[PDB]
Amino acid sequence: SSVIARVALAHEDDVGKNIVRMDEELMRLLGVKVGDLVEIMKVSSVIARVALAHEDDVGKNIVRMDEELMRLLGVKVGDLVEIMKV
Numbered sequence: 673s674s675v676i677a678r679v680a681l682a683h684e685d686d687v688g689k690n691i692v693r694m695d696e697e698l699m700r701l702l703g704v705k706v707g708d709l710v711e712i713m714k715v716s717s718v719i720a721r722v723a724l725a726h727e728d729d730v731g732k733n734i735v736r737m738d739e740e741l742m743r744l745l746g747v748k749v750g751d752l753v754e755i756m757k758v
Contacts, residue, residue: 674756675702677735679747686736688723693736694755695725704757711758712737718745719758 675698682693692712694702704710704722711719712735720741729736735755737747747753 673703674754675733676752676754677733679742679749679751679753680732680734680736681742681749682736682738683726686738688721689738689740690720691723691738692720692741692755693723693725693729695727695730695732697730698733699724702755702757709758711756712745713754713756714745714747714751716744716746 699722706723708722709719710722711717718741725736735753742748
C-alpha cells in the first residue's frame, strides 16, 4: 500500500532521526498507525518509522524528515517520494 508525498524538513525540536511525520488523514489512507515501519523511495530507498504530523499539515500531503535521512535517501526538500507500508 502506498501514498505519494512531498518531502519537507522536520522541525528542529522533532526527535527521532529515523522518524518521519505524516498527517492523520494521510496515515489513515496508507493504513499505518503511529510507530509503524514504512519504506520511502525515490531512486534509493530507506525504511523509517511514522509519527503524527504537527496537525495543520493535512492538506499539504507532505512527509517531514530529518535532513540526514533526506541525505541518506538522496532527496531534497520539495522532492516527491513514495511511502509504502512495509
